[PDB]
Amino acid sequence: MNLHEYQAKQLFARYGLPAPVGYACTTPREAEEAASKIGAGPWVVKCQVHAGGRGKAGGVKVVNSKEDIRAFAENWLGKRLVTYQTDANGQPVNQILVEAATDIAKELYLGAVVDRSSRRVVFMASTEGGVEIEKVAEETPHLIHKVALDPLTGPMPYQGRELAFKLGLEGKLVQQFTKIFMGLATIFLERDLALIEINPLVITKQGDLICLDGKLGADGNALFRQPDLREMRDQSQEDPREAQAAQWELNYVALDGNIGCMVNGAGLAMGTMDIVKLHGGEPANFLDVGGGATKERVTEAFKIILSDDKVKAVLVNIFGGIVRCDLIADGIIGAVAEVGVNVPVVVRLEGNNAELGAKKLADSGLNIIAAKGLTDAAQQVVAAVEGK
Amino acid sequence: MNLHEYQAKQLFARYGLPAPVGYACTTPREAEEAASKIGAGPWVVKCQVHAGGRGKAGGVKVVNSKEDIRAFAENWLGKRLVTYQTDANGQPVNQILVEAATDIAKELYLGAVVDRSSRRVVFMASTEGGVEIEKVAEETPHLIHKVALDPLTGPMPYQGRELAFKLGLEGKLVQQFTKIFMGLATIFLERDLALIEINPLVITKQGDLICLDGKLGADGNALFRQPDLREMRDQSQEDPREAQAAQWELNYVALDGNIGCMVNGAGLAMGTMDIVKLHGGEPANFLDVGGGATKERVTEAFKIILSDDKVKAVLVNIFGGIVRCDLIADGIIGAVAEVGVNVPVVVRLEGNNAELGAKKLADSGLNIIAAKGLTDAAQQVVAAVEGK
Amino acid sequence: SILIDKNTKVICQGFTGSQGTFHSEQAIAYGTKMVGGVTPGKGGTTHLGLPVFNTVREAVAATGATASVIYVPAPFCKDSILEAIDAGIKLIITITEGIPTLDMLTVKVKLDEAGVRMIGPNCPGVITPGECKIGIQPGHIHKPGKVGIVSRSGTLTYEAVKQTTDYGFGQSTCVGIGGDPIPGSNFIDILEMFEKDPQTEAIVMIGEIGGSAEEEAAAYIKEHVTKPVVGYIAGVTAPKGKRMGHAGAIIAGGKGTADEKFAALEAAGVKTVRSLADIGEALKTVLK
Amino acid sequence: SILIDKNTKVICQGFTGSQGTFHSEQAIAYGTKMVGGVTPGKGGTTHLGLPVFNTVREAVAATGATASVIYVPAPFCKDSILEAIDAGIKLIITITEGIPTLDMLTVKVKLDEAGVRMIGPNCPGVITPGECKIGIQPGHIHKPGKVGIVSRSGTLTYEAVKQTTDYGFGQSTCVGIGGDPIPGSNFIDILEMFEKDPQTEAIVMIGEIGGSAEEEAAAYIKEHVTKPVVGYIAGVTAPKGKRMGHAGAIIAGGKGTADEKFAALEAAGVKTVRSLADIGEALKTVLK
Numbered sequence A, B: 001m002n003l004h005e006y007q008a009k010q011l012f013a014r015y016g017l018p019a020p021v022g023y024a025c026t027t028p029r030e031a032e033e034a035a036s037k038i039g040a041g042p043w044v045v046k047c048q049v050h051a052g053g054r055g056k057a058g059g060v061k062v063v064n065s066k067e068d069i070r071a072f073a074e075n076w077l078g079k080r081l082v083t084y085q086t087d088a089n090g091q092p093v094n095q096i097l098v099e100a101a102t103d104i105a106k107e108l109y110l111g112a113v114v115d116r117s118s119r120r121v122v123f124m125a126s127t128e129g130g131v132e133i134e135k136v137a138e139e140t141p142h143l144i145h146k147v148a149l150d151p152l153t154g155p156m157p158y159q160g161r162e163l164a165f166k167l168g169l170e171g172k173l174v175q176q177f178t179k180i181f182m183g184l185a186t187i188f189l190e191r192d193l194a195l196i197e198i199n200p201l202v203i204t205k206q207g208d209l210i211c212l213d214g215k216l217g218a219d220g221n222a223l224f225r226q227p228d229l230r231e232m233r234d235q236s237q238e239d240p241r242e243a244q245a246a247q248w249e250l251n252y253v254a255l256d257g258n259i260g261c262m263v264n265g266a267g268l269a270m271g272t273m274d275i276v277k278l279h280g281g282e283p284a285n286f287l288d289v290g291g292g293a294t295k296e297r298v299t300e301a302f303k304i305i306l307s308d309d310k311v312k313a314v315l316v317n318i319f320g321g322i323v324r325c326d327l328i329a330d331g332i333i334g335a336v337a338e339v340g341v342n343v344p345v346v347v348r349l350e351g352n353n354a355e356l357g358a359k360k361l362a363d364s365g366l367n368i369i370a371a372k373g374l375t376d377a378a379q380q381v382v383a384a385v386e387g388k
Numbered sequence C, D: 001s002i003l004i005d006k007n008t009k010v011i012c013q014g015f016t017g018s019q020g021t022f023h024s025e026q027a028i029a030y031g032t033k034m035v036g037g038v039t040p041g042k043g044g045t046t047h048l049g050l051p052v053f054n055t056v057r058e059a060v061a062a063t064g065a066t067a068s069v070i071y072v073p074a075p076f077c078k079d080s081i082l083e084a085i086d087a088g089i090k091l092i093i094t095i096t097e098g099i100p101t102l103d104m105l106t107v108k109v110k111l112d113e114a115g116v117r118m119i120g121p122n123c124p125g126v127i128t129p130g131e132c133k134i135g136i137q138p139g140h141i142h143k144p145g146k147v148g149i150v151s152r153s154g155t156l157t158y159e160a161v162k163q164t165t166d167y168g169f170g171q172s173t174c175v176g177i178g179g180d181p182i183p184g185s186n187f188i189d190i191l192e193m194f195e196k197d198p199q200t201e202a203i204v205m206i207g208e209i210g211g212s213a214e215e216e217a218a219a220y221i222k223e224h225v226t227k228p229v230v231g232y233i234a235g236v237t238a239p240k241g242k243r244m245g246h247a248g249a250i251i252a253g254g255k256g257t258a259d260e261k262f263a264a265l266e267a268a269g270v271k272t273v274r275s276l277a278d279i280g281e282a283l284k285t286v287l288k
Ligand SMILES: CC(C)(COP(=O)(O)OP(=O)(O)OC[C@H]1O[C@@H](n2cnc3c(N)ncnc32)[C@H](O)[C@@H]1OP(=O)(O)O)[C@@H](O)C(=O)NCCC(=O)NCCS
Pocket: A032, A033, A036, A066, C013, C014, C015, C016, C017, C018, C019, C020, C038, C039, C040, C042, C071, C072, C073, C074, C076, C079, C080, C095, C096, C097, C098, C121, C122, C123, C124, C136
């Protein structure tokens, strides 16, 4: 799950990490109130959205006067920000961060993730502050220093020193940094996160280290044991559908094409989409039927996929199943009517009762097509759609 | 601000109060799985919505089998629950609480609030447990007992005994009951609550006291210092037109007539609304214009108002202001256009430059009436709509 | 006059900040004996041609001011009502909106205890026309007169005023008591002050849902108020359990309803006006 | 055969649970040598005709089983897993899905240090068609044969199977490593076995968007496996950094793409199949 900058900062603080003084506002009035809670201008005002590229977007700005603030807020709350990491209609701004401006000597870069390959959490740093590492690494790969937490001992100071030096810090700075790494190294573990990103980690003119920014991700799987986090979720930031899906053990992801897919299993789902584009199709979504393909379940799928008026056809593809092929068929039919699907449907059943099912399908009279084989259905759909 | 049953429970736990073993779920599976992390049931399943009397509504149920549970959840997640306190359009169910069953010996009632009259935080309690206290009080007021927290000392234990004994407890219950009193009394002030209500607070067969239900209300005005609860807010529960509004520093509130009001001021409005009915009309909303009656601000005001298609007119009443007769009419016009409001709109401009503006209005060439007098306006709009 | 007059000296807390400044220019311009403000850390500067202090205390001394106005953010408001009581101000008027009730709940107590007086919070304020003003009240509409106003709500008040002006009467003073559930001085306090004011010949009391002061005001009045009064209440059309802009403007599980109130008033034998409109209308009656 | 054979004696953790039961049933019906199960508290009884124990230690002592399936819920999983290791199971196959990476992460380690094998989690498991079943694997689709398969995804597999089955081939063993980002066993781990399995004539490797895993294997592969392998990767049309259902399916920093993955095998000299339906086919060839 992602968190908000603000929530991140808040935690850092809870932990003792250094961050700007700031206040998350919800109304221009609160926003404009923070300034003098913060003191002497000028101040920083950032939109709290879950995406990056916030800056380039125009949602981050240094300001000189109370009013100037009013304005920004005025200008953004309610609207939807769109960064390069955003969708198309972007995300919604509902809060705004108001913090103290910082005296920037250097920009570093701190971060952590789980290294699949090495099966470790690794923290990594680099001197290249205020730039996306994917880049950095992509090309100055030697500018990144890394360290891996040992599971046996926790994280230790030497490791922090280590990088600190690797970074060429000195004095208290070194002491400081250690502190932080230790700091985050813990939270990481304490709150089951998946990822951290302080970019830029900054060095102030006054010569101190401070997290200018924060970006976290938590492990969805542990929420059940991170109630604080739990509460912090911002559904406002993701595709609602995705949420609906879950509410029905479904795994939805919206795409770009015109062809609806509904499949039984993530593997399949992808493979299925893939095969289709293969046959010139344009998958318009990923759907993974997690529950038992019961009626309501299939029906619910239907709604969902169909939420996107772009889709011109649907491809169902069922293979294993705790449900009898014939059984499902029924519902699908059912489904088709209950909802009212005015779009062709290709169906690829398999497993039990398979023939009976396809038949029922066919005898149905509706615009359903029992597909012969996988690749057949493929064609068929691409087919129907291309018809136009 | 209110809180979800699970939310209070959490709190109560963090304060060490008794409440049952329970888990909050966001999927059947989940829900379905608690049953055993819980142990043998049967167990209770509660929809979680802010409103009350979820029971009648059938949003509550005791249950005997995983399977059953798994169904309830299937049944209600994503749907709206409608209760006597909801809105013809229930609250949306995004979670369900799964909790252990309890052997109810006796049901008391425990609650507390800020008594405006006396100006204290009052806790009252009764044996009329399990019932809508409003009633009990209203019909048998002598079955409520209360104490008032003294703001000089805080909550004292002798107060807690007092009630315990008025409710006629004896033995350990007395001490237990006392406990809680203090418990809650503490949260109250510590969390800046506005209300609490355990209904009921039960005596279990086994002989102890446990908080079977819980309903908290938070002092909106204090959130600023109460980050925890800030996070707990659940907008889903509320009219979205409400927050939108706020973000604009609007005080919006859906009603039911078909005449809309935009008024400058909480006081003014309600009066306004009032006059309207008074002359026949029947308003559909409360509209406190918060910030400067600035174009943008006004526009929204309209947007929001007009979300209700049952509306067949808009009354605008603007007295004071930190703006100007005209600047205002302008903005109205401006609004009218941009929004594209097709219905008739009546306006009373007050004081400052008010004459010019009205002229400006009648000169605009849209369906805008410059009501002369207040009452006049009133009328006008009533007709306007009446017109049919 | 009531609470204030031309003689009254003022100083404002939060003076430097935005609203403080503004609203000040005005009281000032209207001739309110502004005398300085306070903004911690900004002592020893001037602002609006006035001297700033760092402490109610400092300033009170240095100016002999006796009433203060506050434009301090909700979350500091209390260190302010409070500090002022300490510097021994006798009249506090707190504009601020958003103060947590519990803070107010304590302050009320101190205030009582100290015998100090404060009006508010979350209110327009007060003014004694042509005489002096404090608050966001608006000028040129008032006229010195015999009407005394009290309201749990500001905008409305403008209307009354207006009316009483137009019908010629005018007003002694009008008091904004504020929209908070628990306010510095309630109905009665002010009522009392009125009955005893020679300049005031009559009364307009403006209330609204939620609560009971009005109810309480009645009876009081009934048995303690000679002068005639006119009362308009609001929110008749308002719904249960819902806040209507003002914080203390809600209906607590069936209580504090508008009719309920309207009645109560009638019994105390008050001139209930069900139309904000005929406010002046009714006076004329009684006020003859 | 690769991991399990007909001589493999199994037990179930979370046996009496729902999934536990159902699935146990089938294994049972398929001839898998379920020797019993574990459900804390329920020791003493018999479920599915088999005895139920409070501890793995117990169960083990009693049955000498050496394998175990786990139908235990995320939150408690790691505990069981440890438990098992601790009791001396050498092979674990956890099915559960919803496992906190940190947990697994710490768990793999133990596995290694301990020399224990776990398959999973969040995977169908294993079946050695004809002798042994473990997982939601569906019975009747397999044919005892010379094909070996590993897959990160369950359902897909079933496709494969079907083909090899209809193509005459048959399978040696079927291995579903599971789809979490951090598994107990990975491509290599298994491949290595296949390579050395007399019965496995060739292999089908299946994977998707995700890690290196694939990449990593190629490597290995190229320079460590003689038998022939047909490979396929799901996720070509996948979006960047979006968990595609299976937790471990996501494009990290523009890293873990379908294509990459493909490319990468072909290089290792791998028979790459753009289309899923072609596995039977492709094989034919490499298989002739
Ligand atoms: C208090 C309130 C008025 C703030 O208004 P604001 O001028 O926008 O706030 P600002 O930050 O500009 O100014 C507040 C000032 O208080 C000062 N201040 C803070 N703590 C203070 C204290 N204890 N003592 C004195 N001044 C203090 C701040 O320094 C600031 O001035 P500065 O810029 O010189 O620092 C706000 O809570 C409010 O508007 N409430 C309701 C308004 C309303 O609707 N009124 C009418 C209905 S009653």
